[PDB]
Amino acid sequence: YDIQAWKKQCEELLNLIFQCEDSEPFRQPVDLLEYPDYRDIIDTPMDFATVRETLEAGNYESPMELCKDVRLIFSNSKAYTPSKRSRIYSMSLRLSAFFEEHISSVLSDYKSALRFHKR
Ligand SMILES: CS(=O)(=O)Cc1nc2ccccc2[nH]1
């Protein structure tokens, strides 16, 4: 029932994600010199350094907000991919499975702690 525990749990999950070779394309904002049409396709770019910085700045109120930004990294990858077989898209699918597997308990514990707080 610790309402704040999600933050360190998210920091540790982001550390695991940065160690994972599948996060390489997503560790920093997309470079427009490499992908000049990126903003024609993607409304809201997102990457793991921006997620980490937002968390460390105290700019996420809940793990649901962090989850929404991480899911945006994966939906941007799916929207930009030229094919379902691309290297970077295949990396985002594995990384998404890894993220969803680990964020589930974080979200559950936070929501349970908040329901207890407001009982
Ligand atoms: C900096 S990035 O994340 O590699 C930009 C991007 N996102 C993609 C998704 C699929 C294929 C190529 C893609 N290039």
Swiss-Prot record:
The modification Phosphoserine is found at residue 90. Expressed in myeloma and epidermoid carcinoma cell lines. The modification Phosphothreonine is found at residue 44. It is found in: Nucleus. Transmembrane segments: none annotated. Residues 1-106 form the Bromo domain. It comes from the Eukaryota. It is linked to Chung-Jansen syndrome: An autosomal dominant disorder characterized by developmental delay, intellectual disability, autistic features, anxiety, hypotonia, obesity, and dysmorphic features. Interacts with IRS1 and IRS2. Interacts (via bromo domain) with acetylated lysine residues on histone H1.4, histone H3 and H4 (in vitro). Probable regulator of the insulin and insulin-like growth factor signaling pathways. Stimulates cell proliferation through regulation of cyclin transcription and has an anti-apoptotic activity through AKT1 phosphorylation and activation. Plays a role in the regulation of cell morphology and cytoskeletal organization. This is PH-interacting protein. It comes from Homo sapiens. The chain holds residues 1316 to 1434 of 1821 of the full protein.
